[PDB]
Amino acid sequence: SVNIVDYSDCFEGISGGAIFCNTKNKEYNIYNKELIETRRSPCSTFKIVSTLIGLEKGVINSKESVMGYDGTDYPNKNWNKNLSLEEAFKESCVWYYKKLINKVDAKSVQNILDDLKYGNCDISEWEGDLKNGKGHLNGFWLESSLQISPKEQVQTMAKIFEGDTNFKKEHINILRDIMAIDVNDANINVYGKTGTGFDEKNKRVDAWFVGMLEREGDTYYFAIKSDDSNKEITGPKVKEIAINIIKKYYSV
């Protein structure tokens, strides 16, 4: 049952949409359908999938795993160290995940995205959007060739976390561990990942919060996405919108 809902009150005037889906039943809750079906760059929400890829290929092994920091200077102080998978994920550290993915052959990534039905599965622009001048701080998942809709994000999440892929449960559980977020509410478990990008073509943000909600035996897989024209609208902002929706509409 697809129910069209209105979560405009939690968006505080920001343009976007949301999709929550419970697979135990078939409750699909959709705010702004056109947007929910529209493919965009996943941005850093792809770090959910790239983490599983690195674990599956044995590039990394646990939430402590390191990628061999070489001392390069970065403006974010937390990038300037041999950080663990948990920290790189939570800091959304780009050099860590770029080095990780560049240890995997492209055909393995193609096959994994295909299996996950990950949007357009287009990794043709492997090095990413080089015209932004950022060089090696780029990749196919950052405002580049790969694109996925909020609906497909939710479907991918459900496939992964319901056990419907060949990824090892041990690796799934590492992801659950590092995806958990503190929502000041112990009656629900919230997991997710932000993403932030700007579509220079359309002059709109791609701001994401994608994840899952556990609330008394029921699990909801969700994706919240803004396409606002205001450049101040980021992943973290959209995560706050997501948390407001969860507290207002997915409590009990």
Report whether 72 contacts 95 (CB < 8 A).
Answer: yes
Q: Residue for token digits 């701001």?
A: 207
Of 11-19, 115-123, 184-192, 194-202, the segment contacting ligand CEF by CB under 6 A is 194-202
Q: Which of 119, 150, 197, 211 binds ligand CEF (CB under 6 A)?
A: 197
The length of the chain is 252
Q: Does 192 bind ligand CEF (CB under 6 A)?
A: no
- How many C-beta neighbours within 10 Å does residue 214 have? 16
Query: Toward ligand CEF, which CB reaches closer, 119 or 235?
Result: 235
Query: Toward ligand CEF, which CB reaches closer, 5 or 181?
Result: 181
Q: Does 139 bind ligand CEF (CB under 6 A)?
A: no
Report whether 45 contacts 208 (CB < 8 A).
Answer: yes
Could you give phi then psi for residue 207, rounded to 5 degrees?
-115, 125
Sorted by sequence, the CB contacts under 8 Å of residue 63 that are 6+ apart come out as 84, 85, 86, 174, 177, 178
Query: Toward ligand CEF, which CB reaches closer, 32 or 234?
Result: 234
CB of residue 140 to ligand CEF, shortest distance in Å: 13
Q: Does 194 bind ligand CEF (CB under 6 A)?
A: yes
Q: Does 242 bind ligand CEF (CB under 6 A)?
A: no
Q: Does 142 bind ligand CEF (CB under 6 A)?
A: yes
Site for ligand CEF in 7-26 (CB under 6 A): none
Q: Which of 10, 35, 43, 112 binds ligand CEF (CB under 6 A)?
A: 43
CA-to-CA separations, 21 to 29, 59, 117, 227, in angstroms, rounded: 6, 32, 17, 21
CB of residue 218 to ligand CEF, shortest distance in Å: 27
Q: Does 198 bind ligand CEF (CB under 6 A)?
A: yes
CB < 8 Å & 24+ apart, contacts of 82-89? 85/51, 85/60, 85/174, 85/178, 86/177, 86/178, 89/47, 89/51, 89/178, 89/179, 89/193
Binding site for ligand CEF (CB under 6 A): 43-44, 92, 94, 142, 194-198, 234-236
